[PDB]
Amino acid sequence: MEFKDFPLKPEILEALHGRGLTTPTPIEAAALPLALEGKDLIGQARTGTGKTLAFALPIAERLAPSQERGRKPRALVLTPTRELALQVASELTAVAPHLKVVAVYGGTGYGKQKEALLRGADAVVATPGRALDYLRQGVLDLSRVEVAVLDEADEMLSMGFEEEVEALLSATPPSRQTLLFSATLPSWAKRLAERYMKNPVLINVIK
Amino acid sequence: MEFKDFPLKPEILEALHGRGLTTPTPIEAAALPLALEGKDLIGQARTGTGKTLAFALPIAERLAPSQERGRKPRALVLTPTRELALQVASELTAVAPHLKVVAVYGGTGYGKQKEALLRGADAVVATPGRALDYLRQGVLDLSRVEVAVLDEADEMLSMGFEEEVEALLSATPPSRQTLLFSATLPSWAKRLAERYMKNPVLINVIK
């Protein structure tokens, strides 16, 4: 199946077509049907093999545009690094032209990201430390999140973000969809699935 | 996604609709994109109903009709029990009305099933003991199998069919697609996958 064969808005299909993207990776092809109907998934795939569209397309398809100044984000993607936050935010911005995506990360000051959040956001792609700082400031409000993504859960564990990831998910409605991507499934990741996910389907394309 | 949202022949859609089947289960939804493209898959789902279409629809889609007398089957589905062989044959018959499906199973005589195989078959749904007997007799020919399915591998193990299953798979072309369904993945199922499957994707829906 090409992206064309899935039930995606014409505007999302136009965005993919323009960027030369026609064929899902295996993990994407298997994930899309479940993710597009709002189901929780664990995706186990290696390295930097392609998996961003397994969550970016569902976010794009699920969220209608909003004009409201000051609005809270309806999607949250957590990433282990600034590098990945910027890369994922760029990919999500491209397949979701109708959504305001804001990347949140440390290693820089607080002002610009604060100013972007106060203006309003639809999706936030964040590293966990900075995201938690903003939640504590009451600047990041997660109460309207409908889709939470953990991108490279095992890497977030190895960096020591376990507590921050848990706190952030705890600040989102449990009625949300949760998607967890990790090449390995350490005990902490299994605890997350149990505590923070709803009957997750596991898709493993490691081989 | 409903069945009609997948790239299926219209007459396959009409057969599903006539059976009142509209919506894939989670295992079916996740498996179908890969299975329809001919890829090998392990589907970990409960014993019993809820997975048949993950293999029946790929068979139905892949195999063009033939009227050739004496033709050899292009799909083989192995089941642990005689009751399941009959059930799956009936279900596959219903969604693939263009194919001649032959159930092969013990607990009855040899004559009727032999005659049916010799007349020609597109798909065989079999218990492993009876299938191996017909293979040894030269009645069942597996040299043209394009799709092999192990339906409830753990139950096949529990019933003591490991050697027969392996002998049957070894008689099919390795160019084939292989689909394995089981509620659990004991060592034998893992070794079966290692020997008889090509980079299979794992989809685990167990709750």
DSSP string, chain B: --GGGS---HHHHHHHHHTT--S--HHHHHHHHHHHTT--EEEE--SSSS-HHHHHHHHHHHPPP---TTPPPSEEEE-SSHHHHHHHHHHHHHH-TTS-EEEE-SSS-SHHHHHHHHH--SEEEE-HHHHHHHHHHTSS--TT-SEEEEESHHHHHHTT-HHHHHHHHHTS-TTSEEEEEESS--HHHHHHHHHH-SSPEEEE---
Instruction: Name the nearest CA neighbour of B31 among B10, B61, B9, B11.
Output: B61
Q: Please report where in the chains the tokens 């295992």 appear, as a residue.
A: B27
Residue type, A33: P
Residues B43, B118 contacting (CB under 8 angstroms): no
Residues B158, B80 contacting (CB under 8 angstroms): yes
Neighboring chain B residues of A207 at a CB cutoff of 8 Å: 199-200
The secondary structure element, H or E, covering residue A103 is: strand A101-104
Answer yes or no: do B203 and A207 touch at CB < 8 A: no
Fold of the domain built from segment(s) B1-207: Rossmann fold (3.40.50)
Q: How many other CB atoms are found less than 10 A from the CB of residue B19?
A: 11
Neighboring chain B residues of A57 at a CB cutoff of 8 Å: none
Instruction: Name the phi and psi angles at B43, rounded to 5.
Output: -110, 115
Q: How many other CB atoms are found less than 10 A from the CB of residue A85?
A: 23
The per-residue b/e assignment along A153-167, b for 16 or more CB within 10 angstroms, e otherwise, is: bbbbbeeebbebbbb
Distance CA B70, CA B124 (A): 14
Q: Please report where in the chains the tokens 């394995």 appear, as a residue.
A: B180
Does residue A194 belong to the interface with chain B, where contact is any CB pair within 8 Å? no
Domain boundaries, chain A: 1-207
CB-facing half-sphere around the CA of B171: CA atoms within 13 A:
21
DSSP β-bridge partners for residue A124? A76, A102
Does residue A183 belong to the interface with chain B, where contact is any CB pair within 8 Å? no
For residue B30, give the nearest of A24, A33, A207 by CB distance.
A33
Resolution of the PDB structure in angstroms? 1.4
Tokens encoding A161: 């973000």
Residue type, A82: R
What are the angstrom distances between the C-alpha of A23 and each of A17, A45, B82?
A: 10, 17, 41
Tokens encoding A61: 């398809």
What are the angstrom distances between the C-alpha of B175 and each of A146, B101, B145?
A: 43, 22, 9
Distance CA A92, CA A12 (A): 11
Answer yes or no: do A37 and B1 touch at CB < 8 A: yes
Angle at A71 between CA A66 and CA A76, to 5 degrees: 90
Residues B41, B201 contacting (CB under 8 angstroms): yes
Q: Please report where in the chains the tokens 């027969």 appear, as a residue.
A: B164
Tokens encoding B95: 């969604």
Report how this structure was experimentally obtained.
X-ray
Tokens encoding B207: 């709750």
Residues A200, A182 contacting (CB under 8 angstroms): no
Reduced DSSP (H G I as helix, E B as strand, rest coil) percent helix, strand, coil of chain A, to 5: 45, 15, 40
Q: Please report where in the chains the tokens 């706190």 appear, as a residue.
A: A167
Answer yes or no: do B201 and A205 touch at CB < 8 A: yes
Residue type, B13: L
Instruction: Name the nearest CA neighbour of B200 among B177, B175, B170, B174.
Output: B177
Q: Which of A185, A204, A206 to mutate to test the interface with B (most CBs of B within 10 A)?
A: A204
Pseudo-torsion of CA B111, B116, B121, B123, nearest 10°? -60
Distance CA B196, CA B150 (A): 11
What are the angstrom distances between the C-alpha of A55 and each of A95, A117, B81, B200?
A: 11, 22, 40, 22
Nearest Cα of chain A lies from the Cα of B31 at a distance, in angstroms, of: 6
Distance CA A125, CA A85 (A): 6
DSSP β-bridge partners for residue B185? none
Nearest Cα of chain A lies from the Cα of B39 at a distance, in angstroms, of: 9
Residues B201, A203 contacting (CB under 8 angstroms): yes
Does residue A31 belong to the interface with chain B, where contact is any CB pair within 8 Å? yes
CB-facing half-sphere around the CA of A98: CA atoms within 13 A:
17
What are the angstrom distances between the C-alpha of A27 and each of A39, A42, A84, A112, A181?
A: 15, 10, 19, 35, 10
Residues A123, A75 contacting (CB under 8 angstroms): yes
CB-based contacts of A186, cutoff 8 Å, min separation 6: A154, A157
Tokens encoding B124: 């065989």
What are the angstrom distances between the C-alpha of A173 and each of A176, A196, B194?
A: 6, 10, 42
Return the residue of B nearest to A35 by Cα.
Answer: B30
Instruction: Name the phi and psi angles at B132, rounded to 5.
Output: -60, -40
Pseudo-torsion of CA B40, B44, B46, B48, nearest 10°? 10
Q: Could you give the 3-state DSSP secondary structure of residue A107? A: coil
Find the farthest-apart pair of alpha carbons in chain B and give their distance in angstroms, rounded: 46
For residue A203, give the nearest of B1, B37, B203 by CB distance.
B203
Find the farthest-apart pair of alpha carbons in chain A and give their distance in angstroms, rounded: 46
Tokens encoding B32: 């179908």
Distance CA B35, CA B49 (A): 18
What are the angstrom distances between the C-alpha of A157 and each of A88, A103, A151, A182, B38?
A: 19, 21, 11, 10, 36
Instruction: Name the nearest CA neighbour of B27 among B12, B44, B40, B49.
Output: B44
CB-facing half-sphere around the CA of A149: CA atoms within 13 A:
30
Distance CA A186, CA B143 (A): 43
Identify the sign of the CA torsion A154, A158, A162, A168.
Answer: negative
Does residue A39 belong to the interface with chain B, where contact is any CB pair within 8 Å? yes
The secondary structure element, H or E, covering residue A43 is: strand A41-44
Residues B196, A204 contacting (CB under 8 angstroms): no
Does residue B135 belong to the interface with chain A, where contact is any CB pair within 8 Å? no
Q: Which of B201, B206, B207 to mutate to test the interface with A (most CBs of A within 10 A)?
A: B201
Residue type, B155: E
Distance CA B147, CA B128 (A): 16
Chain centroid to CA B43: how far? 13
For residue B1, give the nearest of A26, A33, A205 by CB distance.
A33
Distance CA B159, CA B163 (A): 11
